[PDB]
Design a protein around this ligand. Structure first.
Ligand SMILES: *[C@@H]1O[C@H](CO)[C@@H](O[C@@H]2O[C@H](CO)[C@@H](O[C@@H]3O[C@H](CO)[C@@H](O)[C@H](O[C@H]4O[C@H](CO)[C@@H](O)[C@H](O)[C@@H]4O)[C@@H]3O)[C@H](O)[C@H]2NC(C)=O)[C@H](O)[C@H]1NC(C)=O
Ligand SMILES: *[C@@H]1O[C@H](CO)[C@@H](O[C@@H]2O[C@H](CO)[C@@H](O[C@@H]3O[C@H](CO)[C@@H](O)[C@H](O[C@H]4O[C@H](CO)[C@@H](O)[C@H](O)[C@@H]4O)[C@@H]3O)[C@H](O)[C@H]2NC(C)=O)[C@H](O)[C@H]1NC(C)=O
Ligand SMILES: *[C@@H]1O[C@H](CO)[C@@H](O[C@@H]2O[C@H](CO)[C@@H](O[C@@H]3O[C@H](CO)[C@@H](O)[C@H](O)[C@@H]3O)[C@H](O)[C@H]2NC(C)=O)[C@H](O)[C@H]1NC(C)=O
Ligand SMILES: *[C@@H]1O[C@H](CO)[C@@H](O[C@@H]2O[C@H](CO)[C@@H](O[C@@H]3O[C@H](CO)[C@@H](O)[C@H](O)[C@@H]3O)[C@H](O)[C@H]2NC(C)=O)[C@H](O)[C@H]1NC(C)=O
Ligand SMILES: *[C@@H]1O[C@H](CO)[C@@H](O[C@@H]2O[C@H](CO)[C@@H](O)[C@H](O)[C@H]2NC(C)=O)[C@H](O)[C@H]1NC(C)=O
Ligand SMILES: *[C@@H]1O[C@H](CO)[C@@H](O[C@@H]2O[C@H](CO)[C@@H](O)[C@H](O)[C@H]2NC(C)=O)[C@H](O)[C@H]1NC(C)=O
Ligand SMILES: *[C@@H]1O[C@H](CO)[C@@H](O[C@@H]2O[C@H](CO)[C@@H](O)[C@H](O)[C@H]2NC(C)=O)[C@H](O)[C@H]1NC(C)=O
Ligand SMILES: *[C@@H]1O[C@H](CO)[C@@H](O[C@@H]2O[C@H](CO)[C@@H](O)[C@H](O)[C@H]2NC(C)=O)[C@H](O)[C@H]1NC(C)=O
Ligand SMILES: *[C@@H]1O[C@H](CO)[C@@H](O)[C@H](O)[C@H]1NC(C)=O
Ligand SMILES: *[C@@H]1O[C@H](CO)[C@@H](O)[C@H](O)[C@H]1NC(C)=O
Ligand SMILES: *[C@@H]1O[C@H](CO)[C@@H](O)[C@H](O)[C@H]1NC(C)=O
Ligand SMILES: *[C@@H]1O[C@H](CO)[C@@H](O)[C@H](O)[C@H]1NC(C)=O
Ligand SMILES: *[C@@H]1O[C@H](CO)[C@@H](O)[C@H](O)[C@H]1NC(C)=O
Ligand SMILES: *[C@@H]1O[C@H](CO)[C@@H](O)[C@H](O)[C@H]1NC(C)=O
Ligand SMILES: O=C(O)CC[C@H](CP(=O)(O)O)C(=O)O
Ligand SMILES: O=C(O)CC[C@H](CP(=O)(O)O)C(=O)O
Ligand SMILES: [Ca+2]
Ligand SMILES: [Ca+2]
Ligand SMILES: [Cl-]
Ligand SMILES: [Cl-]
Ligand SMILES: [Zn+2]
Ligand SMILES: [Zn+2]
Ligand SMILES: [Zn+2]
Ligand SMILES: [Zn+2]
Lengths: 691, 691
C-alpha cells in the first residue's frame, strides 16, 4: 500500500548521514560559487529522485562580506595611538580543515564601515530591559560610547538596534562561556563546547520582514528598481563586530566605572563585569578602536524549487522548505535540516516512481541567503504571493534538525496542534529509556505543557527563520520541529567554523536516530497535509489559545487600573469576539464531522480551513511594520526570535507609564483592542455557514 | 424551463414604474428616519419576494447636515458691512411638493464652518489645467481669495482640493446653463432642464477610497475606535457652497481684473466671465462673504443585504448592489436604479418559489450613505473583506438606470466585455427605429468603439459610485450599465429637488422601456455570472487592453526623449510582461475550451478566472492612496469619476517637467514601471498550469 507508513518506512538514518557528509565538506556561503554548485547538485538529484519539475529561482539581493585584503579587527589603543592588543583575524580552523579555502572570517553581516575609537560600556545582553537598567536606574549614558554586549537571550539585530538608539557609536558582540560553555563538557574538537577562539557569525539587520533591503514588497528580479543604500531597509548605522571569549576577556578585564548592578549581569569570565564607562585607574587613557571594512554588494542567490504535482487538488500547495546557505560548513545549521529534506524528497519520489501521487501538490524548497535575512524565501514569496495566498495550505520549515539530543521542540500555529499530537503518538521515541514508547510519550514527559496535564509544550512562531514570510506576511499555516537540548541563545558552536560533520557524527547523533525522528515528524506532517481528504487543522485549538492570549493581554493592561478607568479602556469587545469565535468554531467542527460524498462541500470546507489562518492577516500591517500583517502573532519587537501574541496591543501597552502624553498612548491601546476584536470576529465569520 | 429567458421574461416595465413611484414620494436622505423606514420596507419586501435571508447591516459614520436654524448663504457686502445681495435659502419646490417637509436645502456636504469674506476669482471648472492656466500663464494668485467655479467635467471634490491647494479661502460652486441647460428644452416642470433657482447638492470629500472618514480600514461598528476630526480622512479645510445660475449671475456680473483667456472659459450667462480678482471700478470695495454653519455628526446608516443561496457553489458570491439614500426625492438618482434592483429580486424570487436556485450565491444590496462618500458599501466591504476577497466572483452596480434616453452606457472590467457583447446581442433594442433589432446593434450604431469596427464603446471604471471598494480596493471583477444621453457633468437636474418621479415619467421614460432594458442587462449579467458552469470571463480581453494601455503610457513618456535617455527609462519590462500575459492567456483559453466531466479542474479553472482580477491588486496600494490597490486602474487623481490606466506610472509622469529634482522624479517613473511589469507578469502566472 501507499500510505503514510510506506512513506515513513522508506526514510533511512544512513541516507541522512550520507547526505549530511556530502553537504558539509566545503563552505556554502550565500552568493559564492560553491553554494551555486550545491544548488545545481540538489536540482539534479531532486530530478533523479522523481520530482515533476525542479527549477532554480534566482534573485540579485544585497549581501555583505569582509574585505579579503583589509581585515576587520578591534584594538585597545594607548594615548600615543599604539595598538597594544588586537583581536583575532580568524578562528583557528578545526583538525583536518586547516587547509580549507574560503572560510569567511567572523564578521557581523551588514555592518557599515568605520574606525570608531572610544570608551567601553558593558550592557549585559543589550536587551531593552538592560538599557532601561543602565539609563534609568544606574544613570549611565551610552551616547558616544562603544558598547560591549554578550550574545544570548535575544536576536543579535535587536541588540544592535537597542545600542544604536542608546547613542552607541559601535557594538562589540562576544560569546560568554556562561551562555556558550556547558559545565563538564570539553571544547571542540574533543566535545561540543565553544573554544575561546570560537566566534558566532550572523547578520545584524532589522528588516521586520522586508526581505532584500533594496526591494521591499517586490522580487529582486532582473528589472527591479532598487532603493539607494541610504533608503535601504534595516541596515545598522554603527559598526559591529563579534569576538570570542579569549578576546573578550582582554577587553573586559580593565573595565572600571560602576560595578554590575546584580549577579544576572555577571558571566563566567574572570573579570568584574564592571559596566564602565571606560577602564580603571592606570588604563583610563587607553581606548577601544574598531576597524570595520566590510562591504555590501548586490549578489545573485539561487533557490531550488521542486514540484510533486497533486493527483486531485494540484492547485493546493503544501510546502516543505529550508535553507542551504551556511556561514561556514553548516554541520548543524542548515545541513542537518537540508539532509533531512533530501531524504524526504527521496522517499516521496520512491512512492511516485511506483505510481502514487499525493492528493495535493507538494513544493520542496532549498532556500538561499537565509543567513543574510531570510532573503531567498522572502524574495520567492514576494514573486509568488498571489499563488501562495490563494493556494497555500501549509508551510513546514526545515532548518537544523538537531540542536541537542534531549527531546522534540515544536513551534506552530494552533491549527496544527492536533496533527502534531496525533502524528507523534504514532512515531517511535528514539530516546534512551523510552524504547517501545511513542515519541508523544517521551516528548510530553520531557517537555510538559505549562497548561495541560499529559500534553507537550508547543511554542508560538516568531521569526528568525524562513517560515516568517509565509506565516507573518501571507497568513499561511506554518510549523517547525527539531530535536533540542534541556532557548534563544543557540547551542555552543552556533555559526562558528567548528560546526562540522564531525561535531554531529561524534557528539550529537552518532546513529542519526534523532535526524530520522525529525524526518518522520516533518515528513509525516507534510504527508498528512498533502494527502488527508479533510485538511488536518482543528479550528477549536485556535479558540482555546485566543482566550489564553486575551486573558494575558488584559492582565498586562490591568497593571494600570487608574488609566483604564480614566480613558475607559475596555477589553469587552475582544472577549466577545473570542467567545463568538469559540461558538462558531464548535459549530463548524460539528458540520465538518457531519457534512455529506459531496466534494464541493468538502472543498468548500477545506477552503474554510485553508483561509482561516489567512483571515488573521490585516492588509494594513502592524504599526510601522507593514510586512508583519498577522494580528494574533508577530515577532517580538524586542527579540525577533520570540513570538508575541496580540502584538499590536502588546506594543501599545509596553512601557506605557513612560509615555509623555497618556491620553494619546491609551487611545492607541484602545485602537489596537478594536483592531484585534474586529479581526478575531472577522476570522470567526469565515467559519460560519457561507450563505 | 428555468433559464435566463424565463428570468428575463418575468421582468416587467409596469412593476419598475410602480416601485419608482413608491420610492420617490418623500425624501430619503442618509441618516434620516424616512431612509431607515424605506430600508425596513425593502427588507420586508425582499423577504416576501423569496430571498433566503435579508438583514440590515448598520454602521455609525460621519455625515454632514446644514443647521436648520442657522442657514447657509452667500452675500455681496459693501464697505459698510451691509449685505446687499443674498443667495437663496432653498430651491423653489416643484408643483405639488411645496408642502413636503424635510427637503434638505442645497449645501456642500462636509464643508467646514466659516464666514470668509474676500475678492472673487473665477476658475472655470477648477480643473488641474484651469489652475495651471491661472497661475502659470495668467500669473493670477488665488491665495486668500474666494474662488467661484462652475460644476461639470470633473468630480466636485477634485475642484475643492485644487482650490484649497491654490490657497483659496472658500469655494462657490454653481451650475452654468452652458453645462446644465440643453438648447431648445424647457426648464422643470415643463421640461428636463435646470431652472435658474435649481442647485446641485453633493459631497466634497477626497476620501481616495477610505469610506467613513473616522474609521479607515475597519468597519464603523459599535466598538469602533474613531479618529478625532482633526485626523479624519478627506475633509476640506475651506468652506464650500453651491448655488444656481440666477444667483451666480449676480456674483459674476461685477467681476473685473483679467478677461477670460479664451472661449473655453466662457459659459452661457450674460456676463464677461472675467477672471478677477475682485469686481470692476465702482464695485471694487465690495466683497463676497460666505456663511456656512453646517455640522458633521456621527449618524447611523443601514444597508439591506439579501441572500439567495447557491445550489452548487454557495461559497461563491455574485453581488448586485446599488444605493437607496438620496439628496431629496431621488427620482433618477438612485431610485431609478433601486426600482430596477427591486424588480430583479422579484424575478429571481419567482424562479426560486418554483424550485430553482442559481448555481452560485447571489447577494443583493441596498446601500446607504452613497451620497456622503460611498460610506455604506465601503463599511460593509471593510467588515466582510475576507469573505469577499476569497469568495467574490463579481459586483454589478445599480445606481440610476437612466440619465438619458439615447443609448446604453457600459463601464466594466475587460473580463466582462465578452459577456456584455453576447448578452446585448440577445436583448431587444428599445430604441425608436431599431424595432426588431438587437440592443447590441443599436448600441454599437450609436456609441461606436473608437478602436474596432462593428463593436460598441465600453469605458473603464474609476470611482464615484459603490463599485469602488469592490473593484479598486478588493480586486473583484465589476461592471455597470445604464441608459445615457448623446459625460462627467451629470444631466441637468442632477442632485436637485426637481429630480422627481414626474421628471422620469413625463420626460425620460414614459413607457419604462429603457428601465426595462437596463433591468435585462443588469439582471442578465447577474444571471450569467451566477449560473454559467464556467465563469463568463475572457482573460484574452484583458491582454488586448493591457497592450493598448502600455502603448498609451509609453507614448506619454516619449514626450520626454532626452530624460528617457539620461535616466535610462525603459518600458521593455512592461511590454515583455504584456506579451507574456497574452501568450499565457491564449494557452489558458485553449485549456478552458479543452479541459475534461471533472469538477475540480472546472473549479480549479473557475478559481483561476475569479482570482485573475484579484491578481492586479498590490497590497501596498498606490502612492499615498493605500485604498486604491488595483495596479491597472485607479480613479484619476484629477477627477474621481474617470478611470486612469497604469495610474502609478501616469501620476509619476504627470507634469514631470515641472519637478525640481528630475533624477528623483524619473527614478519614481522607473519604480512604477517595475511595479506594473511585475504585477502584469504575476497576474499572467496565475493563469499558468498550477503544477
Ligand atoms: C458576537 O456575536 C454577537 C451575535 O450573537 C454580536 O452581537 C451583536 O452585538 C451588537 C453590538 O452590541 C448588537 O448591536 C446592536 O444592534 C441593535 C440592532 O439590532 C442596535 O439597536 C443597537 O444599538 C443601540 O444600542 C447601543 C448600545 O447601547 C447604542 O450604542 C446605540 O446607539 C443604539 O441605541 C446595537 O447596535 C447586535 O444587534 C448584535 N447582533 C446580534 C445579536 O445578532 C457581537 O457583536 C459579536 N461580537 C463582536 C466583537 O463582533
Ligand atoms: C516573460 O517570460 C519570459 C519567459 O519566456 C521571461 O524570460 C526570462 O527572462 C529573464 C530576464 O531576462 C531571464 O533571466 C536570465 O536568466 C539566466 C538564467 O536562466 C541568467 O543567467 C541571466 O542573467 C545574466 O544576464 C543578464 C542580462 O544581461 C545579466 O544582468 C546577469 O548579470 C547575467 O549575466 C538572466 O537573469 C530568464 O532566464 C528568462 N526565463 C525563461 C526564458 O524561462 C521574462 O522575464 C518574462 N517577462 C517578465 C517581465 O517577467
Ligand atoms: C486526531 O485524532 C483524533 C482521535 O482519533 C481525531 O478525533 C477523532 O476524529 C474522528 C473523525 O472525525 C471522530 O469520529 C467521529 O465521531 C462522530 C461522533 O461520534 C461521528 O458523527 C463521525 O461520523 C466520526 O466517526 C472522533 O470523534 C474524534 N475523536 C475525538 C476525541 O475528537 C482527530 O480528528 C485527529 N486530528 C486531526 C486529524 O487533525
Ligand atoms: C460569447 O459567445 C461566443 C460565441 O458563441 C462564445 O465563443 C464560443 O464559445 C464556444 C464554447 O467555448 C466555442 O466552442 C468551442 O469550439 C472549440 C473549437 O472549435 C471546441 O474545441 C470546443 O469543444 C467548443 O465547441 C466557440 O469556438 C466560441 N466562438 C468564438 C468565436 O470564440 C463565447 O465564449 C461567449 N463569451 C462568454 C460566454 O463569456
Ligand atoms: C556529493 O554527492 C554528489 C552526488 O553524488 C557528488 O556529485 C557527483 O560527483 C560525481 C563524481 O565527481 C560526478 O560524476 C557527478 O556528475 C556528480 N553528480 C552531481 C549530481 O553533481 C559530489 O561529488 C559529492 N560531494 C562530495 C563533497 O562528496
Ligand atoms: C595590531 O595591529 C596593528 C595593525 O597591523 C599593528 O600596528 C601596525 O604595526 C606596523 C609594524 O610595527 C606599523 O608599521 C603600522 O603602522 C601599524 N599600524 C597601525 C594602524 O598602527 C600593531 O602592532 C598590532 N598590535 C599588536 C599588539 O600586535
Ligand atoms: C410603498 O409600498 C409599500 C409596500 O406596499 C407600502 O407599505 C405598506 O403600506 C400598507 C398600508 O399603509 C401597510 O399595511 C403595509 O404594512 C406596508 N408594507 C410594508 C412592507 O412596509 C407603502 O405604503 C408604499 N409607500 C408609498 C409612499 O406609497
Ligand atoms: C441678507 O441677509 C442678511 C441676514 O439676514 C440681512 O441682514 C440683516 O438684516 C436685519 C434687518 O434689517 C438686521 O437687523 C441684521 O443685523 C442683518 N444681519 C446681518 C448679518 O447683516 C440683509 O438685509 C439681507 N440683504 C438683502 C439684500 O436682502
Ligand atoms: C578592500 O581593501 C583593499 C586593500 O586595502 C582596497 O584596495 C579595496 O578598495 C577594498 N575592496 C572593496 C571591495 O572595498
Ligand atoms: C548623553 O550624552 C550626550 C552627549 O554629550 C548628550 O547629548 C545626551 O543628552 C546625554 N543623555 C542623557 C540622558 O544624559
Ligand atoms: C547527548 O545526550 C547525552 C545524555 O543525556 C549527553 O550526556 C550528551 O552531552 C548529549 N549530547 C549533546 C550534544 O547534547
Ligand atoms: C445651529 O444653530 C442654532 C441657532 O443659531 C444654534 O443654537 C445651535 O448651536 C446650532 N446647532 C448645531 C447642531 O450646531
Ligand atoms: C500668492 O499670495 C500669497 C499671499 O500674499 C503669497 O504668500 C504667495 O507667495 C503668493 N504666491 C505666488 C506664486 O505669488
Ligand atoms: C428622449 O428622446 C427624444 C428623441 O431623441 C428627445 O427629443 C428627448 O429630449 C429625450 N428625453 C431626454 C430626457 O433626454
Ligand atoms: O535574519 C534572520 O531573521 C535570521 C537569520 C538566521 C537564522 P539561523 O541562524 O540559520 O538559525 C539568524 O538567526 O542569524
Ligand atoms: O462620493 C463619491 O465618490 C460619490 C458620491 C456621489 C455618486 P452619485 O451622485 O449618486 O452619482 C456623487 O458623485 O456625488
Ligand atoms: Ca524584495
Ligand atoms: Ca471604516
Ligand atoms: Cl526549523
Ligand atoms: Cl450604476
Ligand atoms: Zn539556519
Ligand atoms: Zn544560521
Ligand atoms: Zn447615485
Ligand atoms: Zn447622487
Amino acid at each position: 500500500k501507499h500510505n503514510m507508513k510506506a512513506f515513513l518506512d522508506e526514510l533511512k538514518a544512513e541516507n541522512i548521514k550520507k547526505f549530511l557528509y556530502n553537504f558539509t565538506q566545503i563552505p556554502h556561503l550565500a552568493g559564492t560559487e560553491q553554494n551555486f554548485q550545491l544548488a545545481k547538485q540538489i536540482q539534479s538529484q531532486w530530478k533523479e529522485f522523481g520530482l515533476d519539475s525542479v527549477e532554480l529561482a534566482h534573485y540579485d539581493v544585497l549581501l555583505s562580506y569582509p574585505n579579503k585584503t583589509h581585515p576587520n579587527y578591534i584594538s585597545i589603543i594607548n594615548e600615543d595611538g599604539n595598538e597594544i592588543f588586537n583581536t583575532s583575524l580568524f578562528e583557528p580552523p578545526p583538525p583536518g580543515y586547516e587547509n580549507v579555502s574560503d572560510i569567511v572570517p567572523p564578521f557581523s553581516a551588514f555592518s557599515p564601515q568605520g574606525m570608531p575609537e572610544g570608551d567601553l560600556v558593558y550592557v549585559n545582553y543589550a536587551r531593552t530591559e538592560d538599557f532601561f537598567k543602565l539609563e534609568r536606574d544606574m544613570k549611565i549614558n551610552c551616547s558616544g560610547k562603544i558598547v560591549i554586549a554578550r550574545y544570548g537571550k535575544v536576536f543579535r539585530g535587536n541588540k544592535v538596534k537597542n545600542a544604536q538608539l542608546a547613542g552607541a557609536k559601535g557594538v562589540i558582540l562576544y560569546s560568554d562561556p556562561a551562555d556558550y560553555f556547558a559545565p563538564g563538557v570539553k571544547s571542540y574538537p574533543d566535545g561540543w563546547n565553544l573554544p575561546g577562539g570560537g566566534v558566532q557569525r550572523g547578520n545584524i539587520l532589522n528588516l521586520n520582514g522586508a526581505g532584500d533591503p533594496l526591494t521591499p514588497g517586490y522580487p529582486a528580479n532582473e528589472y527591479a528598481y532598487r532603493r539607494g543604500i541610504a533608503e535601504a531597509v534595516g541596515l545598522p548605522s554603527i559598526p559591529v563586530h563579534p569576538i570570542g571569549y579569549y578576546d573578550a576577556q582582554k577587553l573586559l578585564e580593565k573595565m572600571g566605572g560602576s560595578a554590575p548592578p546584580d549577579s544576572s549581569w555577571r558571566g563566567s569570565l574572570k573579570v568584574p563585569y564592571n559596566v564602565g564607562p571606560g577602564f580603571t585607574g592606570n588604563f583610563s587613557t587607553q581606548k577601544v578602536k574598531m576597524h570595520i571594512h566590510s562591504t555590501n554588494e548586490v549578489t545573485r542567490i539561487y533557490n531550488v524549487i521542486g514540484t510533486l504535482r497533486g493527483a486531485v487538488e494540484p492547485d493546493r500547495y503544501v510546502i516543505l522548505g529550508g535553507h542551504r546557505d551556511s556561514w561556514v560548513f553548516g554541520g548543524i545549521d542548515p545541513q542537518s535540516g537540508a539532509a533531512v529534506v533530501h531524504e524526504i524528497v527521496r522517499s516521496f519520489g520512491t512512492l511516485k516512481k511506483e505510481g502514487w501521487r499525493p492528493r495535493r501538490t507538494i513544493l520542496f524548497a532549498s532556500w538561499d541567503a537565509e543567513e543574510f535575512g531570510l532573503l531567498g524565501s522572502t524574495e520567492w514569496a514576494e514573486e509568488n504571493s498571489r499563488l501562495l495566498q490563494e493556494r497555500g495550505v501549509a508551510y513546514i520549515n526545515a532548518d537544523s534538525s538537531i540542536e541537542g539530543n534531549y527531546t522534540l521542540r515544536v513551534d506552530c500555529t494552533p491549527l496544527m496542534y492536533s496533527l502534531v499530537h496525533n502524528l507523534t503518538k504514532e512515531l517511535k521515541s528514539p530516546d534512551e529509556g523510552f524504547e517501545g514508547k511513542s515519541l508523544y510519550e517521551s516528548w510530553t514527559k520531557k517537555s510538559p505543557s505549562p497548561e495541560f496535564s499529559g500534553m507537550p509544550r508547543i511554542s508560538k512562531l516568531g521569526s528568525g527563520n524562513d517560515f516568517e514570510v509565509f506565516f507573518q506576511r501571507l497568513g499561511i499555516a506554518s510549523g517547525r520541529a527539531r530535536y533540542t537540548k534541556n532557548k534563544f541563545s543557540g547551542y555552543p558552536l552556533y555559526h562558528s567554523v567548528y560546526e562540522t560533520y564531525e561535531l554531529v557524527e561524534k557528539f550529537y547523533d552518532p546513529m542519526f536516530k534523532y535526524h530520522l525522528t525529525v524526518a518522520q515528524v516533518r515528513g509525516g506532517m507534510v504527508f498528512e497535509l498533502a494527502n488527508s481528504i479533510v485538511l488536518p487543522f482543528d479550528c477549536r485549538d485556535y479558540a482555546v489559545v485566543l482566550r489564553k492570549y486575551a486573558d494575558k493581554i488584559y492582565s498586562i493592561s490591568m497593571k494600570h487600573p487608574q488609566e483604564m478607568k480614566t480613558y475607559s479602556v475596555s477589553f469587552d469587545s475582544l472577549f466577545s469576539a473570542v467567545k463568538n469565535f469559540t461558538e462558531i468554531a464548535s459549530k463548524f467542527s460539528e458540520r465538518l464531522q457531519d457534512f455529506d460524498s459531496n466534494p464541493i462541500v468538502l472543498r468548500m470546507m477545506n477552503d474554510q480551513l485553508m483561509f482561516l489562518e489567512r483571515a488573521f492577516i490585516d492588509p494594513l500591517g502592524l504599526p510601522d511594520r507593514p510586512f508583519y500583517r498577522h494580528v494574533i502573532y508577530a515577532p517580538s519587537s524586542h527579540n525577533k526570535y520570540a513570538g508575541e501574541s496580540f502584538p499590536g496591543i502588546y506594543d501599545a501597552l509596553f512601557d506605557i507609564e513612560s509615555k509623555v502624553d497618556p491620553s494619546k498612548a491609551w487611545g492607541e491601546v484602545k485602537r489596537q483592542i478594536y483592531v484585534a476584536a474586529f479581526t478575531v470576529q472577522a476570522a470567526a465569520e469565515t467559519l460560519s455557514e457561507v450563505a
